[PDB]
Structures are given as structure tokens and as C-alpha cells.
């Protein structure tokens, strides 16, 4: 029967109704989809349901109806009311009302799982196994039970090649799958999933999805999953809502809702052609090996010869763990290669760059900007400080405000949105507003070579087309060369021109994005 | 209530120590080093990339119910869960504006959740990485607590706090993290605080003139301001010593009548 | 400005925008520019100021014909600006001087 109700709740943040008139009902087992634009309020609503600090309602309330042991503090599924405890006592049914200091809240909060958006809730130094082992031990199980699960689990998110590998040294989506496998292994009453797949490539996303079903839908644990990327909302949820700017634009069967949402949408802007101009970078036998006396060699880049031709947009597509981030860090002179040559044609001289110093790598590093896949801002500074004063803008402070506003507008914010966003902290933004702010922070210094590790990933098709036309305009009006690591194919077709495929540290073949597509499929 | 005095004394050195200890005293800033430049000199993380984590965020981890523990608000870097990093400073005895015990006392009086350590030629403060970067930029580097000549952000090999200054008035550095650029008159960090070279040298500004260094220093010197000119501090030190002696002998009110 | 030698000094316009007119700097005398006379309240009109070593553009001189409570005559905040003097008698020529042109000053104490 019924798990939680949502009364008429209007969440506001200082004359900012992030959410208003939100109400839905769930039962013991069902998947609920939360579909909407970027900044619609999905992360706020999931932190709202989780009961995190600062997400208390101003108008309404939500009721959690659970089972409970008054001698054991175990919360359970409401369906357990009528069954026999794992202790003495039988059970008792509670209408825990969150934000009402209702004791059970603590136990219930322990019984609910959350997949945070772009935040890896892992111990870092506790490898992969101990991280998942922790989840089991923490939640309960036992030596054998844990072991069985641990192994059965590492199989589901596909991590048998990284078992003893330190989770701090993992790679993006691998950490995402690690956090996921930690998140099933607690027996929740509810699994709130914020962008559960992440900027994950089709294939790995499919494994994550099946793993989710294989587990949460088997234990009839209700699912609240957001993706403003529909194809999952359909393949996972049966009842989904569509909200727009915090207001439920629709509440229906997931199929109809996804249809309606996708109609609201736009196609790409297929820009005009561009001719490129000479080779700028030349990498010859670039290798990057991570040797351990305790886990083996991880040949991240295994011999890679690439060339970029100056004003051009270069793509790097592949599967998770192929070596794209390691390659992009080698290009940006962040991570030195174990072996191999890299020369950057500053203007006509090719500086040997596996040599640190202003006399050598520095020369080209003034005009190299990198947006990292695991990006960050300065949370103690404002957005305006982040664009202008945190990195060092070569202009007086009076005239930096309109420069930052122009950069935010060029990224794809409106004038009102960029004006309202300037006097704000990064914690007050959404994941996708922070991503665009970090992209603007890379772009505002106007470097020559720009590396963009997954610019998209949390952008509605519309926001993505926006960031896209941005890169295209800046490349032509400013002859900026770009290197793009991406998973969205249509972004590569309508943006890139000479993408390359990476598979296990190799380059396989380089060519047109359509040619890359027919090589992939 | 109680109005907090911070340090006894009438001299300029005691006034500077009181100003450093005072959390309501706004330290005068003398340079602008950007946040990413401070991160680059710190050498812990690449600027623009996310902070490495040591544990899940405090909402994700489940703790026992503790009323006294939950009364204290954690730091933001503790809320998200970040590794604890350090920033280390060496201070010359020749009129450096900040001094190691003064640095430790001011850090523990002004900052939350910090780990201060004091040596003769070393002073280190440890905190969560985001908060540590915040007060490294806001207080430690750009204000009158820092002078690029007589002080320096340095780990690894530290030596030269008691040595004489060089021809440019800078503290001796065995690894030469910061050099003097005579064309601009500024000190530039060519290496980070531990010693690996930087790809782009970072301007930490120009050396403070010696006349200002006499006014803003917190050390007592015969050629500057000596403790013989500040008898109030010596009397307080002697009173503390006598009170410790009397408490260690017999800790009663009648034995403290001879205080 | 050259008033150490002659009775009339020369200021060169370096950058101009509406109310602001910034003058050229000398990267040979701007060494000990410690923050000296920093504003406490809103800066009034016709105030000459030099940015101290705190800001990146240390030594640049400027003046604005209006008043604001946030930024000094050179586009920097108050902690990065030290007031050196003011324009007393002759005005309405800072709004009709192009970039690169030299204006001449006379000290009236």
C-alpha cells in the first residue's frame, strides 16, 4: 500500500518559488519519474524528500508511512505491518511527518538511499571492494552474506577489472557506478536517484539501468528517479510527472508524459562550414601507465598518435574507462606522459612539452584552458568573483561585471538570469548552472586551445544546443581550437568535424563524425 | 558581558600582536593574489578540478544520536567531505610581520577547525581543503600577515629564519621557490610550497619596505622594539610563571596570597 | 606628472569611459605605493586618486566627474585606492579630451 504522500508544498528561497503546487502519491512498489528542464527543481525536490538541511517546506508537508519496531529502531516497508520482526515485538505503523522532529525520522532517514547529482559519496581511499563491503557491513549482512553480495554486486555495475583499485584513482563514471553499488546495498524503503546514470555512455548506462531494475524493482522498493534525458524515464518509470520551473506542467502515465515533453524541444542549428588552419598539436607515441606494486599496470593511454589542425573542433568519443580524461589531461599539460612526444606549434615553433617550466611547457600553457570532467568552483566566492577575481581578469574591477555578464550570456543565459546569478554562491546554483559557469570561467580568459571534458551531461536538449552554438561561434569569430570529449552522438555530428574513437588507450580510426558513427554501428 | 583584551603591552609589537589576535580587527591587505594562483602555489590540487574526498558527505554517513556533538556546526569542507591539507610558512627573525607563535595563536583565535603547529623556523596550519584555501587567500596571503621577502609559503626544506637577508631583502631559501624580478620589482614564485617547478611564475607582489616592516612586525628586537621597552609583557610573563609555580606547589587560596 | 621640476605638470589620458578618465602611469616611481589615504565614505566628484600596490593596476591615476559609494576614480574598490588630491577650479574639460591627449595641471595648494 501507500508509502508516502505529498501535500500542496510550495518551496521558496527569498521570493524564489523554486517549487510550488507539488503533490504526488506513491505506493509500496512503483517507479516515479521527475522530468523537466534544467533548473526545474528536481534536485531540490529530491533533497526535499531526503530531508536535508535547508530544504524545509514553507507551505506544505510530506508524510512518510512506514513500519517500525519500538525496541529495535528498524523502519522497513509499510507492508511489513502485520509480519514478524527481526526482534521481539510485532510491528507498528507510523505516519512519520518529515520536518516535524518525529524520532523515527532518524531511523527512516537511515533507511532511505540517495544518489547525489555530480557528487561521489565514497570513501576515496577505501578502494572499490571495501567501499561496497562498507555499505553491506554498515547496513548489516554478515561475512558470507556481505561477500556473496559484494561479488554479485561488483558484477552488476561492472567493476571486476577494478576490484582492489583505489576508488580515489577511479575515472568519473566508474566512481558513479561505485556510488550506485554502495547505494543499493542498504535495503532502502525508497531509492531517490538524482541523475543515476550520469554523463554515462549508452552501453554503461544500460548496465546501470538493468542493475537498478535487477535490484530495486525486485525488492519492490519505490523509485524516485529524475533524468531530464527521457529514454530512461520511459524504460524505467510507469508513472512520471513533467514539471516546468517548479510547477507540475503535467502528471501522467510516463509514456504520455515523455511524449508531451519531447514535443516541447528544438532541433540542432547545423552551423556553416569552416576551413581549419595548419597543425597546432602533434602527439606521437603518448603512453600513460599507472603501475602499482599491489594491483598491476593500468595502461590508461597506450600509444596514441593524434594531430589537431588549429582552428577546428576535435572530438574524442569512446566507452567509460577508455582513457579520454587521461589524454585530455596530457594535452592540457596537467598530467605528464610516461612516454611519448607532444609538440605545440605556438606560431611556427613546436615547443617540446613534456618539459616543465616557463621556458618550455609554460609557453603554450598560457593559451591552454581545460574544463575538467570533475569540475569545481570556489564555494566561498560569488559567481561574479568566480568569473572575474578568482582567476585574475586583466581589467579594472568596475568593468569586469559586464564582461562576466557578456560571457554568461554567450554561454547561454538570458540577461535577466545572468544579472540575477552574479550575486550568488555556487551552492545556490543547480548542477548544469554550475557546469555552464565553469565553462564560462574557462572561456572568459580567451585561450587558444580549449579542452572541454563533457560539456553536456545535465543539459536539456535546448541548453545543449546552446552551449554548442557557443563553442561554434567562438571558434569562428575568435579562431579558437577545441578538443571535445563527449558521449552524445548528435552533438558530435552537429558540432565536431574530425572526431576520433578511443578504445583501451588506442586511437583505432580518426575521421568524420558520421564515419565514426558507422564504425561504432 | 566580558570585553576581551588580547595581549598586554604598550609598544607597537604588542599592539600588532593584539591586532593579530583580534578577530574583529580587519587586517590591512597589501596585494591581490587570485584564488587559482594561491591554489597553484599551494600545490595540493589542480585549479578547476573538484576537491578529492576522504569520506561521504555528513548527510550520507549515518552517525549515532549525539546531542552535544550536533550542537557544533561543521565546516563546509567537512559537510561535503574533503581531505585535510596544509599550508606552511617560514618567518624571518628580521622584522617579518607574522611570527610562528603569533601565527598559531591568531589562527586558533580567528579560524574554525584548524590544526596549528609551531616550530622555531616553521609554522603549519591544517584544515579541510576548501576552507583552507579560503582563509589562505583571504587572510594568510593578501593581508599584512604576509610579506613575500621576509616570509614565504614553503614546505619540504625550511631553513633561513635566523639567517640574514639576501641582497634583495628576501629570506634565504635553499630550494629557491620565490625569486626577485628586478624589471618589475616584484617577487615571483617559480615553484610551489613543496618544490616542484611551476609552469607559469606567479606574482605574489613586491617586498614590503623596511619602514613599514618595523611598524607591522610582531617580533621583539634590540634594533627594533625590545621587551625592555615593554615592561608590562614581562610582568605578565612573570606572573604566569609564579602562578604556575604556586599552583604546582600547593593549589590553595592561602598559597596564592603570595602572588 | 613632473611637478617636481616645473610649475606645470602633464597628465596623459590612458583610458576613458563616460564619467571616468584614467591617466597614464610611470612604472619606475610606483614602488612604495602602500595604501595611504583610503576612502572611508563615498568618494565625491573631482577627486584624483592612485591605485596602490594592492590592485593589479598599481600606479594608474584617474578622476571621475560623479560620485559613487563603491568604486574609486580608477575602477578599483576603496581598499585599493589612495586619494592624492582633487581638482579645484577648472572642470568640464575632462569630458572633451580624447584618449592619448595631454592635459596640463597647476598646483594651487
Amino acid at each position: 500500500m501507500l508509502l508516502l504522500e505529498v501535500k500542496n508544498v510550495s518551496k521558496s528561497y527569498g521570493d524564489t518559488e523554486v517549487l510550488k503546487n507539488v503533490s504526488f502519491e506513491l505506493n509500496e512498489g512503483d517507479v516515479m519519474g521527475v522530468l523537466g528542464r534544467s533548473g526545474a527543481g528536481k534536485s531540490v525536490l529530491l533533497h526535499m524528500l531526503r530531508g536535508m538541511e535547508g530544504y524545509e517546506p514553507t507551505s506544505g508537508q510530506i508524510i512518510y508511512h512506514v513500519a517500525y519496531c519500538p525496541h529495535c529502531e528498524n523502519v522497513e516497508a509499510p507492508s511489513q505491518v502485520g509480519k514478524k520482526c527481526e526482534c521481539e515485538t510485532e510491528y507498528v505503523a507510523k505516519s512519520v511527518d518529515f520536518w516535524n522532529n518525529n524520532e523515527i525520522t532518524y531511523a527512516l532517514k537511515k533507511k532511505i538511499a540517495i544518489m547525489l547529482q555530480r557528487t561521489f559519496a565514497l570513501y576515496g581511499e577505501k578502494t572499490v571492494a571495501e567501499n561496497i563491503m562498507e555499505a553491506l557491513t554498515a547496513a548489516g549482512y554478515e561475512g558470507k552474506d556481505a561477500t556473496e553480495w559484494a561479488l554479485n554486486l561488483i558484477k552488476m555495475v561492472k567493476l571486476e577489472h577494478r576490484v582492489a583499485h583505489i576508488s580515489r584513482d577511479l575515472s568519473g563514471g566508474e566512481k558513479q557506478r561505485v556510488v550506485l553499488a554502495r547505494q543499493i546495498a542498504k535495503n532502502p524503503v525508497i531509492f531517490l536517484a538524482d541523475e543515476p546514470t550520469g554523463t554515462l555512455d549508452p552501453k554503461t548506462a544500460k548496465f546501470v539501468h538493468n542493475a537498478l531494475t535487477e535490484a530495486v524493482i525486485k525488492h519492490n522498493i519505490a523509485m524516485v528517479i529524475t533524468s531530464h534525458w527521457p529514454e530512461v524515464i520511459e524504460e524505467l518509470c510507469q508513472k512520471a510527472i513533467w514539471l516546468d520551473k517548479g510547477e507540475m506542467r503535467l502528471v501522467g502515465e510516463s509514456k504520455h508524459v515523455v511524449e508531451e515533453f519531447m514535443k516541447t524541444v528544438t532541433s540542432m542549428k547545423e552551423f556553416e562550414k569552416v576551413e581549419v588552419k595548419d597543425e597546432l598539436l602533434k602527439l606521437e607515441n603518448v603512453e600513460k601507465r599507472y603501475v602499482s606494486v599491489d594491483r598491476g599496470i593500468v595502461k590508461a593511454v597506450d600509444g596514441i598518435d593524434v594531430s589537431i589542425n588549429e582552428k577546428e573542433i576535435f572530438g574524442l568519443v569512446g566507452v567509460s574507462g577508455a582513457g579520454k580524461t587521461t589524454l585530455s589531461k596530457i594535452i592540457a599539460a596537467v598530467i605528464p606522459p610516461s612516454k611519448g612526444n607532444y609538440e605545440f606549434r605556438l606560431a611556427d615553433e613546436w615547443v617540446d612539452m613534456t618539459k616543465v617550466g616557463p621556458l618550455y611547457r609554460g609557453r603554450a600553457k598560457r593559451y591552454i584552458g581545460m574544463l575538467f570532467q570533475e569540475y569545481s568552483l570556489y564555494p566561498h566566492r560569488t559567481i561574479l568573483y568566480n568569473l572575474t577575481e578568482s582567476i585574475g581578469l586583466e581589467m579594472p574591477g568596475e568593468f569586469a561585471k559586464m564582461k562576466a555578464e557578456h560571457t554568461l550570456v554567450s554561454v547561454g543565459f538570458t540577461e535577466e538570469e545572468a544579472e540575477n546569478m552574479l550575486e550568488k554562491h555556487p551552492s545556490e546554483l543547480s548542477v548544469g548552472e554550475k557546469h555552464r559557469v565553469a565553462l564560462a570561467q574557462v572561456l572568459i580568459r580567451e585561450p587558444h586551445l580549449i579542452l572541454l571534458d563533457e560539456p553536456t551531461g545535465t543539459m536539456d536538449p535546448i541548453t545543449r544546443n546552446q552551449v554548442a552554438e557557443s563553442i561554434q561561434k567562438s571558434r569562428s569569430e575568435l579562431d579558437q581550437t577545441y578538443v571535445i570529449v563527449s558521449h552524445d552522438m548528435d552533438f558530435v555530428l552537429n558540432v565536431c568535424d574530425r572526431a576520433a574513437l578511443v578504445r583501451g588507450g588506442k586511437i583505432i580510426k580518426t575521421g568524420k563524425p558520421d564515419e565514426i558513427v558507422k564504425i561504432l554501428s | 558581558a566580558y570585553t576581551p583584551q588580547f595581549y598586554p603591552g604598550a609598544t607597537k609589537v604588542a599592539e600588532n600582536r593584539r591586532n593579530h589576535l583580534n578577530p574583529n580587527y580587519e587586517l590591512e591587505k597589501l596585494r591581490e593574489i587570485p584564488d587559482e594562483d594561491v591554489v597553484k602555489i599551494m600545490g595540493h590540487r589542480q585549479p578547476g578540478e573538484d576537491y578529492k574526498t576522504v569520506h561521504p558527505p555528513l548527510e550520507e554517513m549515518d552517525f549515532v544520536e549525539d546531542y552535544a556533538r550536533d550542537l557544533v556546526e561543521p565546516l563546509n569542507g567537512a559537510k561535503e567531505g574533503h581531505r585535510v591539507r596544509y599550508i606552511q610558512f617560514a618567518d624571518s627573525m628580521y622584522f617579518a610581520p607574522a611570527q610562528p607563535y603569533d601565527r598559531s595563536r591568531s589562527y586558533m583565535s580567528r579560524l574554525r577547525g584548524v590544526d596549528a603547529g609551531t616550530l622555531s623556523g616553521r609554522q603549519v596550519v591544517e584544515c579541510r581543503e576548501s576552507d583552507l584555501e579560503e582563509f589562505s587567500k583571504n587572510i594568510l596571503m593578501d593581508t599584512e600577515l604576509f610579506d613575500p621577502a621576509t616570509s614565504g609559503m614553503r614546505g619540504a626544506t625550511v631553513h633561513g629564519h635566523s639567517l640574514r637577508l639576501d641582497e634583495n631583502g628576501m629570506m634565504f631559501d635553499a630550494l629557491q621557490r620565490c625569486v626577485f624580478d628586478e624589471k618589475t620589482g616584484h617577487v615571483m614564485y617559480v615553484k610551489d610550497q613543496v618544490g616542484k617547478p611551476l609552469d607559469a611564475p606567479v606574482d605574489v607582489g613586491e617586498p614590503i619596505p623596511e619602514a613599514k616592516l618595523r611598524e607591522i612586525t610582531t617580533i621583539y628586537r634590540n634594533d627594533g622594539v625590545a621587551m625592555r621597552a615593554d615592561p608590562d609583557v614581562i610582568e605578565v610573563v612573570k606572573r604566569i610563571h609564579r602562578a604556575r609555580t604556586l599552583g604546582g606547589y600547593i593549589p590553595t587560596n592561602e598559597t596564592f596570597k603570595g602572588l | 606628472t613632473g611637478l617636481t621640476t616645473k610649475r606645470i605638470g602633464t597628465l596623459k589620458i590612458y583610458f576613458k569611459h563616460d564619467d571616468i578618465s584614467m591617466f597614464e602611469r610611470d612604472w619606475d616611481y610606483s614602488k612604495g605605493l602602500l595604501p595611504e589615504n583610503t576612502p572611508e565614505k563615498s568618494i565625491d566628484s573631482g577627486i584624483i586618486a592612485v591605485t596602490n600596490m594592492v590592485k593589479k593596476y598599481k600606479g594608474y591615476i584617474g578622476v571621475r566627474t560623479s560620485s559613487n559609494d563603491k568604486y574609486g576614480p580608477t575602477g578599483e574598490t576603496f581598499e585599493g585606492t589612495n586619494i592624492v588630491g582633487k581638482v579645484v577650479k577648472n572642470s568640464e574639460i575632462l569630458k572633451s579630451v580624447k584618449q592619448g591627449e595631454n592635459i596640463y595641471i597647476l598646483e594651487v595648494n
Binding site: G362, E394 | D181, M188, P201 | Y57
Partner: peptide
């Protein structure tokens, strides 16, 4: 914009020009 280009040309502290000790010879 014209003002953005004017600011970029007028206030470009080039590290090679300002710090010739390191980026040159």
C-alpha cells in the same frame, strides 16, 4: 563589443612583456 576590445587591448598585462626574466632569455 567595441568596449570589450578596447579593454582587452588597453589592459593586457602580457607576462612575456611584464616578466621578461622568465619567459624570455
Amino acid at each position: 563589443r567595441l568596449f570589450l576590445k578596447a579593454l582587452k587591448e588597453k589592459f593586457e598585462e602580457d607576462p612575456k612583456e611584464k616578466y621578461t626574466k622568465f619567459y624570455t632569455f
